[PDB]
Design an enzyme around this catalytic site. Structure first.
Site, mmCIF file in Angstrom:
data_model
loop_
_atom_site.group_PDB
_atom_site.id
_atom_site.type_symbol
_atom_site.label_atom_id
_atom_site.label_comp_id
_atom_site.label_asym_id
_atom_site.label_seq_id
_atom_site.Cartn_x
_atom_site.Cartn_y
_atom_site.Cartn_z
ATOM 1 C CG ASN B 185 -12.930 46.047 -38.309
ATOM 2 O OD1 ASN B 185 -13.411 46.638 -37.343
ATOM 3 N ND2 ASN B 185 -12.308 46.668 -39.299
ATOM 4 C CG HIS B 187 -14.280 41.672 -34.941
ATOM 5 N ND1 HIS B 187 -13.548 40.998 -34.001
ATOM 6 C CD2 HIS B 187 -13.397 42.259 -35.774
ATOM 7 C CE1 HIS B 187 -12.264 41.175 -34.248
ATOM 8 N NE2 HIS B 187 -12.147 41.940 -35.334
ATOM 9 C CB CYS B 222 -19.907 34.655 -30.758
ATOM 10 S SG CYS B 222 -20.453 33.475 -32.015
#
Ligand code: 5RG
Ligand code: 5RG
Lengths: 265, 263
Positions: B185, B187, B222
């Site tokens: 995804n 991330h 982040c």
């Protein structure tokens, strides 16, 4: 995994793990290249190497990768079982070759293949040398004696000359540094990390619309633990092709060049 | 791997791979953290989901607040490790996943891990935790009586971690994730942050000591295009305080502590 009946090749099955899949929910070429090097290591363990022989260890000689060539037809899904077969061959005095076939366990279809050129180097001086008769003999017994090629085609992309990218690059990713996880057990940068660095300058748009089919990478110089790399890419082309350069951000000393070929999803 | 007889936990075996081993030919704590995660996903798959679903109606996701790992022995290359994982409800505060790592040959406990997860909107963040109606769905997959990888009343896994004050004793600056650091995804995967924390440990500690404990608080994610500074200060066995913050404005993404034993 296991050596096959004739003990001249080695086979291993891997279940693709959740953290091994990228943006297409299928295994990354980097995960794949790690599995190739895992099966390569298990083959060397299976025939009593450690990939040094007795003679090499005596002379402080090592095998190092000069080229890697991977072609993927279909990336295995998360939870898919992939089977990999690997074997080696002597290329006379030049060096050795290791080759790989990837198969879908269920269908038995070839979903990928790879080949790689190794050259002999003094561990300490980093100086290349041709393969000596004694070394040739010691591992000729673990290799098919008739030619067996992952890439048999008459003019196959696996052996093409790669030119040097001229500045300015079309695309760049600057200030790439290996972290400790990029290091092998001997504190050397993993050969796979350089695959990651090459692909970091591929624009998002290509990643979104295309899938990687082919990658060819020459290894010129190794990036040390405390080096910084720049990754450069220029379009050379339904199919997109790119020219690749990794060099050290300071003096621009070349560590790698490559080509990648992408086809529309 | 498979659900155990009672269907209230999940078990799986891994052969440590060549590329998974570090500087002393035993598995990195990063390899380990990836195995805990893999076994977590396989547990979620098996009981009909690693994102517990049918709550997603209102676009909510589970998100890690805290990871705590303790290793007694790192498996060698070729070794077989058995990991057992289960999940537990901590009322409306959030949710716990626990792990026990065993040597497959000796049946000896070689490590254990625990983690606090909280409910987040996802399109919004707003960590609104709670459940009542959402809990019932995924409480039939958990032991009803408490089952704790770290049962000891007042144990390390629950200690309050303070904020490192400048200047740091050690720093590694300009850390950036690559595409290999992203999950499906896009991330940054939570194991990468473990890597970024340990990047500010001096070489000489890596040379003389072995990581025994790591506790990491996850404050903010982040992004793909963020840059991180990793800061470490000796607080003493050697102990360290840790801070990840964005290179630019110094927004905290993580804090933690590591404990190392002499080799
Ligand atoms: N490294 C990657 C990992 C996942 C992915 F979908 C794409 C890439 C890439 O480099 O283009
Ligand atoms: N990442 C690592 C990989 C191997 C190792 F021996 C130590 C570390 C560390 O972070 O200190």
């Amino acid at each position: 995994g296991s050596l096959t009946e004739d003990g001249l090749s080695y086979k291993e099955k891997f279940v693709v793990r959740s953290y091994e899949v990228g943006s297409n929910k299928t295994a990354t070429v980097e995960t794949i290249a790690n599995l190739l090097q895992e099966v390569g290591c298990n083959h060397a363990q299976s025939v009593g190497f450690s990939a040094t022989t007795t003679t090499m260890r005596k002379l402080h000689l090592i095998w190092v990768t000069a080229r890697m060539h991977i072609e993927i037809y279909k990336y295995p899904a998360w939870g898919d079982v992939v089977e990999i077969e690997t074997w080696c061959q002597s290329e006379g005095r030049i060096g050795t070759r290791r080759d790989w076939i990837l198969k879908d366990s269920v269908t038995g279809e070839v979903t990928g293949r790879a080949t790689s050129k190794w050259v002999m180097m003094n561990q300490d001086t980093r100086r290349l040398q041709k393969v000596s008769d004694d070394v040739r003999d010691e591992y000729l017994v673990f290799c098919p004696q008739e030619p067996r090629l992952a890439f048999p085609e008459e003019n196959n992309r696996s052996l093409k000359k790669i030119p040097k990218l001229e500045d300015p690059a079309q695309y760049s990713m600057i200030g790439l540094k290996p972290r400790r996880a990029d290091l092998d057990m001997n504190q050397h940068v993993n050969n796979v990390t350089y695959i990651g660095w090459v692909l970091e300058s591929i624009p998002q748009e290509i990643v979104d619309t295309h899938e990687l089919q082919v990658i060819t990478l020459d290894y010129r110089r190794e990036c040390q633990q405390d080096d910084v790399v720049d990754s450069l890419t220029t379009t050379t082309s339904n199919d997109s092709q790119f020219l690749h350069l990794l060099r050290l951000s300071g003096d621009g000393q070349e560590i790698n060049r490559g080509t990648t070929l992408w086809r529309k999803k």
